[PDB]
């Protein structure tokens with residue numbers, strides 16, 4: 034039947050035109066994955082990059098239940114405890130689409146231990162790994178050590194052999210507060226800090242020397258895993274973002290631009 | 305807990321020796337080998353893809 | 355017994371150019387994993403190199419060795435047109451590849467939207483059309499023919515086909531073929547080197563305490579410049595001053611420019627994917 | 637406490653060892669080898685944007701459906717290299733797709749926990765099955781209204797499309813379920829989890845009848861022998877194993893010292909003589925089910941393969957790799 038063939042050809046042509054438009058749209062927009070420990074304040078960066086009262090009260094109930102499991106008199110004792118809980122100061126994949134100037138971006142927010150879905154993400158330009166820099170003292174192996182192990186697992190992946198990592202360190206104010214207080218010193222949990230010293234080249238913000246030493250020690254510990262592996266198609270860009278920093282979006286834009294530039298420069302045998 | 309009960313339930317299952325199962329599977333494979341376009345190439349004229 | 359060695363060398367050069375261009379073209383065409391917007395430009399360069407090596411190199415060798423153009427007067431004009439077209443297409447395709455690299459590095463986000471398969475096809479069609487306009491048109495309708503008493507008899511004669519052109523065409527055609535691509539590619543590679551140096555400085559500043567670009571850019575620019583620039587400066591000079599330039603120097607420089615075409619594939623197809631394709635093919 | 641379970645497991649292992657009398661290779665060593673097999677790419681299906689994660693042949697052995705990370709679920713007519721329907725997807729990520737034996741419905745679910753089916757007879761969703769936790773791995777159609785889906789929470793579930801709720805739930809896997817296969821009689825189905833354990837379930841009863849844990853790495857593929865009494869599992873480890881249901885233990889192991897990559901899909905032939913298994917090394921291998929000897933290597937894919945499929949008529953086998961291009965291999 035010639036009519037059936039003609040109809041099938043017309044449908045094929047229409048679908049091909051729609052597919053070409055969709056391919057142009059897909060190539061226009063980049064993709065980023067946001068991986069976090071859950072207690073690393075990944076939501077703060079998500080808000081920074083881009084019923085309610087009952088939910089906030091519900092979170093207080095979880096803290097209240099955790100405090101009892103571990104009221105005003107006992108409230109002070111609960112804060113000193115080290116356990117998985119929400120913030121005490123106040124009391125399902127997600128897709129975020131944002132457009133930096135004249136460019137299209139799209140964020141991936143995954144909602145465990147096996148992480149067998151990591152191989153699915155291979156076309157993303159970068160992985161926005163978010164880790165709390167003030168989580169060294171809290172223990173479950175310390176949470177910071179667990180985050181470092183997860184970063185090592187992601188970095189040394191056969192499937193993710195050409196995906197870079199954008200690294201964020203929230204709770205900088207919290208890190209400074211814990212370092213300056215002196216309780217739970219870095220040397221107590223990280224023996225290398227006693228031998229560690231401030232790097233000769235550094236740009237610290239007008240901050241106490243101890244805070245700078247701690248922050249740079251954490252940054253170097255994270256960067257050692259990245260530098261140990263083979264060079265090329267892998268680069269980590271540490272950042273020291275605060276709890277409230279509106280410049281994070283420009284930082285990730287610059288990091289993605291550098292990722293594309295360095296991929297193209299490693300290609301053509303230039304870099 | 306319930307794993308013990310699950311294993312106890314799964315234990316009471318009749319078993320067929322490997323020789324009989326292998327012989328039956330080989331007999332099936334030999335019997336149905338004729339109608340296997342992958343095993344025996346099909347004629348080009350009768351091949352739908354060519 | 356001295357011409358035979360030159361003939362053997364010319365035959366070897368022609369065979370090498372043909373084999374390299376054919377291998378590059380068949381590697382680009384056969385495997386779909388190698389098809390890319392820039393790889394279309396590489397394919398155009400390889401096709402131009404193949405046409406040049408299969409058309410002008412053996413005929414040029416026959417002209418040089420026998421010192422007599424056996425074929426007719428009309429066919430020699432066609433051969434000269436083919437030569438000019440091939441050279442212009444090759445040089446302008448090198449310029450286009452450099453521009454593609456500049457737009458891929460300097461403007462990364464806009465590079466994907468700027469270049470597409472249709473855009474690459476349009477660019478290749480435009481560059482081949484401009485090469486044809488520069489080569490075939492001024493030759494077939496005899497604008498390039500000289501006006502002085504010299505070589506007018508050569509035009510009339512059938513055996514003689516030595517190149518003799520006006521002071522005008524020898525400058526404009528030379529500019530269009532080489533000088534504009536030279537300036538464009540120099541600016542491109544300066545910008546690319548600056549970007550690479552900036553990136554290396556950033557790597558040193560960030561991941562410190564734990565010259566490839568210069569070498570590769572040197573290879574890419576130096577091969578082209580050393581193999582073509584002297585020929586085109588001689589092209590300008592002999593028209594400006596006919597006393598200095600002899601025929602042998604002209605032919606030698608032109609053939610160095612020719613063998614640049616055979617040198618090109620081994621410097622523009624060094625990617626590991628191309629090596630894997632070559633290994634699989636043979 | 638756990639001592640009773642350990643004793644039961646030891647007794648099960650002893651019973652399985654006692655049942656084994658002669659190995660499969662010991663009996664099949666006298667059969668003629670299948671011989672060298674050369675398969676050419678009958679057709680190539682291009683134009684698909686991103687890496688394919690799964691595909692499923694039609695019950696008519698002609699049409700097929702493929703899905704990628706681009707969010708496009710495009711239905712292909714394999715005979716004429718023509719795409720009939722292109723279905724945009726609400727969720728960008730798709731880990732599996734299914735084609736109903738009736739052919740009227742096409743299932744498509746992925747990293748989003750919600751599974752959705754489409755009514756082909758434009759295209760629109762019928763009932764987005766959302767009563768699930770975790771991502772999906774593979775889905776199949778028992779009928780036009782009952783669909784069984786895998787899980788990322790180690791809970792294979794059965795669905796009633798009209799009701800929209802889980803009719804029954806299957807539990808017992810330590811790790812996430814990565815693939816499953818259905819029987820010709822649709823009475824029972826098996827599922828290979830990430831805990832290196834393959835379990836056979838009874839659809840009516842809702843409890844695992846047996847459990848096979850001979851592997852060492854995560855199991856990524858499972859399919860039935862055409863007989864229905866034997867299923868072969870392809871694990872992340874290079875070994876591909878063939879199990880039995882009446883013998884209740886492993887029968888054969890397919891492995892070579894040259895291959896060290898993983899396996900992403902396993903599918904039998906029409907007669908079951910050839911076990912076609914994909915690999916992460918950009919190539920698909922063809923094994924002999926009985927003699928356990930490789931009988932050819934299929935290639936032509938730039939990236940790793942992810943899915944396989946053999947038509948009900950057995951005319952040809954299809955492969956969809958990460959290179960965003962399917963291939964039909966008669």
Ligand SMILES: CN[C@@H]1CCc2c(ccc(O)c2O)[C@H]1O
Nearest residue numbers: 437438441442517527528531608
């Ligand atoms: C006889 N050989 C020709 C003469 C002039 C000429 C060549 C190449 C490119 C040009 O733009 C030219 O003007 C040479 O190949």
